[PDB]
Design a protein around this motif. Sequence first.
Motif, PDB file in Angstrom:
ATOM      1  N   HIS A  47      21.135 -12.648   3.418  1.00 47.92           N
ATOM      2  CA  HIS A  47      19.336 -12.195   2.981  1.00 47.92           C
ATOM      3  C   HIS A  47      20.030 -10.444   4.101  1.00 47.92           C
ATOM      4  O   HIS A  47      19.048  -9.704   4.361  1.00 47.92           O
ATOM      5  CB  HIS A  47      19.463 -12.585   4.084  1.00 47.92           C
ATOM      6  N   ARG A  81      13.390 -20.337   1.259  1.00 46.30           N
ATOM      7  CA  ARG A  81      12.538 -18.814   0.436  1.00 46.30           C
ATOM      8  C   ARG A  81      12.519 -19.990  -1.095  1.00 46.30           C
ATOM      9  O   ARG A  81      11.827 -19.576  -2.353  1.00 46.30           O
ATOM     10  CB  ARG A  81      14.073 -18.238  -0.357  1.00 46.30           C
ATOM     11  N   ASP A 184      -1.301 -16.793  -0.001  1.00 47.12           N
ATOM     12  CA  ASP A 184       0.264 -15.941   0.522  1.00 47.12           C
ATOM     13  C   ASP A 184       0.728 -16.042   1.472  1.00 47.12           C
ATOM     14  O   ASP A 184       1.695 -14.810   1.176  1.00 47.12           O
ATOM     15  CB  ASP A 184      -0.395 -14.581  -0.648  1.00 47.12           C
ATOM     16  N   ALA A 188       4.627 -14.857   2.507  1.00 48.50           N
ATOM     17  CA  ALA A 188       4.748 -14.069   2.704  1.00 48.50           C
ATOM     18  C   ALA A 188       5.672 -14.310   4.639  1.00 48.50           C
ATOM     19  O   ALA A 188       6.308 -14.101   4.944  1.00 48.50           O
ATOM     20  CB  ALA A 188       3.581 -13.067   3.326  1.00 48.50           C
ATOM     21  N   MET A 191       8.799 -15.877   3.646  1.00 48.39           N
ATOM     22  CA  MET A 191       9.738 -14.419   3.266  1.00 48.39           C
ATOM     23  C   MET A 191      10.846 -13.565   4.495  1.00 48.39           C
ATOM     24  O   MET A 191      11.452 -13.418   4.830  1.00 48.39           O
ATOM     25  CB  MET A 191       9.769 -13.445   2.236  1.00 48.39           C
ATOM     26  N   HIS A 192       9.251 -13.103   5.593  1.00 45.12           N
ATOM     27  CA  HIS A 192       9.459 -12.593   6.901  1.00 45.12           C
ATOM     28  C   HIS A 192      10.518 -13.521   7.946  1.00 45.12           C
ATOM     29  O   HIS A 192      11.499 -13.198   7.840  1.00 45.12           O
ATOM     30  CB  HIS A 192       7.916 -12.873   7.825  1.00 45.12           C
TER      31      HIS A 192
ATOM     32  N   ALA B  85      11.178  -9.326   0.726  1.00 43.69           N
ATOM     33  CA  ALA B  85      11.226  -9.346   2.227  1.00 43.69           C
ATOM     34  C   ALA B  85      10.958  -8.666   2.958  1.00 43.69           C
ATOM     35  O   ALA B  85      10.675  -9.094   4.322  1.00 43.69           O
ATOM     36  CB  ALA B  85      12.670 -10.276   2.011  1.00 43.69           C
ATOM     37  N   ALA B  88       7.663  -8.113   3.789  1.00 43.09           N
ATOM     38  CA  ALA B  88       6.917  -9.845   3.930  1.00 43.09           C
ATOM     39  C   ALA B  88       7.035  -8.641   5.782  1.00 43.09           C
ATOM     40  O   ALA B  88       6.217  -9.616   6.526  1.00 43.09           O
ATOM     41  CB  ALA B  88       7.927 -10.264   3.765  1.00 43.09           C
ATOM     42  N   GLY B  89       8.743  -8.094   6.018  1.00 45.84           N
ATOM     43  CA  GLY B  89       8.553  -8.257   7.217  1.00 45.84           C
ATOM     44  C   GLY B  89       7.628  -7.229   8.078  1.00 45.84           C
ATOM     45  O   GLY B  89       6.878  -7.108   8.818  1.00 45.84           O
ATOM     46  N   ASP B 184      -0.134  -9.324   0.487  1.00 43.48           N
ATOM     47  CA  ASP B 184       0.981 -10.085   0.770  1.00 43.48           C
ATOM     48  C   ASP B 184       0.921 -10.871  -1.116  1.00 43.48           C
ATOM     49  O   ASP B 184       1.099 -11.577  -1.479  1.00 43.48           O
ATOM     50  CB  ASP B 184       0.045 -11.571   1.022  1.00 43.48           C
ATOM     51  N   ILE B 187       3.973  -9.464  -2.836  1.00 44.24           N
ATOM     52  CA  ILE B 187       4.874  -9.948  -2.090  1.00 44.24           C
ATOM     53  C   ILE B 187       5.596 -11.168  -3.346  1.00 44.24           C
ATOM     54  O   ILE B 187       6.049 -11.993  -3.445  1.00 44.24           O
ATOM     55  CB  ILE B 187       5.189 -10.685  -0.681  1.00 44.24           C
ATOM     56  N   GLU B 559      16.782  -6.478   4.809  1.00 39.95           N
ATOM     57  CA  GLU B 559      16.730  -5.816   3.650  1.00 39.95           C
ATOM     58  C   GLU B 559      14.623  -4.870   3.251  1.00 39.95           C
ATOM     59  O   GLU B 559      14.467  -4.557   2.590  1.00 39.95           O
ATOM     60  CB  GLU B 559      15.276  -7.926   2.844  1.00 39.95           C
TER      61      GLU B 559
END
Lengths: 633, 633
Positions: A47, A81, A184, A188, A191-192, B85, B88-89, B184, B187, B559
């Motif tokens: 990651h 994930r 969605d 997300a 993934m965050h 990823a 997403a953050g 989103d 993603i 990421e």
Amino acid sequence: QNLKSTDRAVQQMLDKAKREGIQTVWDRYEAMKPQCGFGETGLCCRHCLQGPCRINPFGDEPKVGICGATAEVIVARGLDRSIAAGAAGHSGHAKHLAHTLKKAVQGKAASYMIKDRTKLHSIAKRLGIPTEGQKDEDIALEVAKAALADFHEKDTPVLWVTTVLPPSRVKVLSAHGLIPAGIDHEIAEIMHRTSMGCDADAQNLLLGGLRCSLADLAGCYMGTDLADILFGTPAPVVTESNLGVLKADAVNVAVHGHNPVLSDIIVSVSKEMENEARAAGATGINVVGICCTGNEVLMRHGIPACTHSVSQEMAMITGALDAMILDYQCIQPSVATIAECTGTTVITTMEMSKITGATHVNFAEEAAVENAKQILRLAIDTFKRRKGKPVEIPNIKTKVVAGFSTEAIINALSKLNANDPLKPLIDNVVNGNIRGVCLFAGCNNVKVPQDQNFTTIARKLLKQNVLVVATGCGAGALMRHGFMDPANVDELCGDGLKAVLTAIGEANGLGGPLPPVLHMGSCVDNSRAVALVAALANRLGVDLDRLPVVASAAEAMHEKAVAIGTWAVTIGLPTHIGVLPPITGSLPVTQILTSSVKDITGGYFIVELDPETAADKLLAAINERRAGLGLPW
Amino acid sequence: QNLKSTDRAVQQMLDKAKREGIQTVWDRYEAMKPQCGFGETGLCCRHCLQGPCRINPFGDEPKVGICGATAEVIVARGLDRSIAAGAAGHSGHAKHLAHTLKKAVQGKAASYMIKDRTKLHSIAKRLGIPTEGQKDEDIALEVAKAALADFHEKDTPVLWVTTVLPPSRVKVLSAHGLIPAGIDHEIAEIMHRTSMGCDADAQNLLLGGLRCSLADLAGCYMGTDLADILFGTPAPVVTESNLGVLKADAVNVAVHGHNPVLSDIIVSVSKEMENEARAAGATGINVVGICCTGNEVLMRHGIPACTHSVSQEMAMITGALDAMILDYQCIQPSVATIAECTGTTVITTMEMSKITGATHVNFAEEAAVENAKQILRLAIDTFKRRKGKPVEIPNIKTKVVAGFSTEAIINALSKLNANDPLKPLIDNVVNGNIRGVCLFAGCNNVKVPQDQNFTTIARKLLKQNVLVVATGCGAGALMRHGFMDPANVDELCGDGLKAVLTAIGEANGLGGPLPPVLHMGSCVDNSRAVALVAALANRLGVDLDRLPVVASAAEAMHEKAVAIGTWAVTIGLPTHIGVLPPITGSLPVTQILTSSVKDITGGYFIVELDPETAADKLLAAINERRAGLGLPW
Ligand code: SF4
Ligand code: SF4
Ligand code: FES
Ligand code: FES
């Protein structure tokens, strides 16, 4: 070849591929052995670019990730994930259908229409969308609107979760913060939270994963709802399965992938094009199905199923497959390479899913009939080019009775009790003629001899009087081995179950039983199983985690199957998986998913690679529920 | 210790940790060597349970994934999930701020307010939201509404992409289908397309990745816009950096993570609590920053920066850090374990980001001042418990001038030309006093001696008259080594650049130059660099890929940094990365990202691990652009 597949038609094609030097999925698996133990146990993380990090399952260093991530954090993040990826695929599918319904009722795609009006109105009513006095096209607009709105945050939670589960179940999930805010949105957020230096508590991580699995359920249910509106709710049908449904003297076209938006149209237009095909020297166009889009047209149109999952390349090895028409998900990219050897025309149709070397034909819902003819014309050209070539279609097939939507199952039962259709099923649960219900779902996996876990476990449950239902390639596995042929009820089913299957089939006037296994549809149609089970919970006034109902992803492969298994656990079911998921590198995570999650949702995973043992465990889970309802077992 | 970090304060703490037997990020890196070569080259796939699959970079089998996925498909899919990823953050961050603005103007969170009214109105105007005659709270409602709407599909594309880039750039991206439909949305589509048996064409995959990187840019820009409205647009400030900003006789509180929603409040309340702190025997509360939320409060309030990225554990090793207050992203989970040794109170505050062993204090924007006092009271208790303990704060710090938002840079330039503030910058580009512009961004990485690439490359560019701007931990690296102290301009800067920095600082009446490097803020504040560069493109009437502007993620880790690098390439910049991303296992993918993408977006990656060589390459990229504008170089 029996070590690779238990399917005799597949074994025959494996010998042909070996003879011809065509490499298969089993050859590429052999060439990958021995596989990485860090990845198989889940103890690997990539990651961030300080990686890759790995953790020895046992022994000395390394014991921890470079940033400090522990085994249980690495394992839970990887699992999360996987779930998000599964959610994203079912979600993309459902979104595609929602845009298609919207386009259709906007006059923007005439190839599509509202076919199931009754389903449209009942979905509208469950969502709270008023129908009284409204045009069908306006209700459909509002339903498509609602579908699209569940992908993101809004004033309500995801309604394709909260309106399809009984209130008691929703309250339990809300109590643990597990109801998704938006499909969605959850993907997300996973993934965050799983990116570097973010969520780092196994329990917290896995709770996020349960909630994202319910986003996957939403997408599955939404997909089923929308495909039923557009293409019709399935009703019982009879067809065939396995490679012998290919016909040397026909134009053989496989539909492969997932979305009926495509395959439904291929089916209707292919009928329009019979004379064109006849002109080119073919008897006509033989549409056959592969993987879930093949299930979709089997369920609605009785299109014969050619093959599934891990053995999909074998349809090409026959030499008779003129075209393979694809949209997305679960297509081995090897097919584009194999095509050069086998003469097959591989055609991709979706902008986000191309395969180097395949022909790409844009599919626009707006131009659906036109695009579909262009595609079938490539097929006919290919047919004409194998004029004179010998083919080897194994003369092997089974008879398949299918089309058991939940509505069809309710209607079938209604013949035994018109105003209380579920009661006859529950009576037989109570008296013991039906021990309980097992859902088989999910893929084949090259690590397991193809179909061996599905048929071994299904045989032992059916003898024990379990009502078996199936979807996706679990349905594929069982159909290809005779489990959907009513002539095998005597051989396969215990007396109690036989009694019930016979009582219901006779009442539906067919002088014989329903088949041994009820085919409930594609993997999004696992949502149908949810509707049935939820209806049963509601009729009983109990939650799902008190019902004698289990699930088995006996040969799981795809991220999607991981997502489905996890939401089965989340809505309250004992859920078997017959391949190792990458969690064994963490005993705390394993313990959460196989045991303490019982205290949160009442469901739980059952990890068991030995199918006879798995069957035993699934029976024990069923009988425990029987015990908790005070029934004999 | 010079092999681990070039920061002398960090070296001192490494010796202390070694003495005390406290394991650090460098120790866990050593224990991970040698690292997996399949993962470092990108030749590993775990996207289904038939995996893990690996591919030998060279030699014999395995050569292909079990499903047929080629090296270039495996590499592109892995890269794409990294970008998603990252997206997403930054996206989660921006969403948090949008909900906070909405809550605030809804009377639902009084601790928050519209502070930058002018910024609110200009964002509203750029989005097309009418302001004329409207209440500030209503315009803000509409802006928050618009922010939230860009996360999903709607009638418009993502406006925090299409309204922040010049029309010529948007048209180029639209022509290749690269404009995101929803943040989103992109993603999830990436996670879908990269799941098993879906997208399997390297070019197609990477085009999806470019579009998802623009979703990351949107989230960055939205984050900056919203944090400026709520907390104020930065203006020049002077403070300090490095461990010496800790004070043994104070309550030392680090804010760490990313979102100013939290840290801004810690800052204001900590001032309210000075007497409480004084009562407990402290001089007061010493708020210091770590990672990007530390940049946010440095930029707006002049809060001194303690440390960044890879060396974050060292703040704890001093023995003087009473509390570490976290929200999400880039926090080494090791801090929770280290805390037991160092006495530090580690506090998490966000439901989706917990760390086993840390204390968790729910932070509600609704209860922000109250929650912040609870948290600071844990801090004071901790201070009181180290009464009498010796600490080792390295007496090492630098002076930092910062706060150069794009608005502040425009205002500074306006002193040399009131109605055409960009013109003086462009004049000096043209006459050669400014060779071009380099943005340093992104992380430190344990594989690179900390800060060595950022300072080596920055020194060689500054001597060559490059205007250097920086964000995130690239700004951290340069601040901790003196690059933001105007007293080092003579030593560091070429004469032409010195001339310009001096001309502008004098005109802003300070009898001395601007600092050698302009600190533009946190990593979401890379969007500020975009606004500046876009303004320059617009003023010149050319697109960004004709400007002598480059970027360098010289020690990339997260990421998020991969996402930023990719959108730098997508908007048209030559973009250096100084750590190997996992693409070397595929020459076709490498070739796309370092060369043919020039033909699509005009930007391109520059992969170079040797910093002197990287500087050379970045200078060559700058001078090539100079040549294309017909300038001498
Ligand atoms: S996130 Fe942590 S465990 Fe994963 S690769 Fe990065 S340093 Fe290693
Ligand atoms: S997706 Fe393909 S390459 Fe990846 S693990 Fe599964 S079989 Fe292997
Ligand atoms: S070390 Fe093999 S999967 Fe990473
Ligand atoms: S084989 Fe090491 S990263 Fe997978």
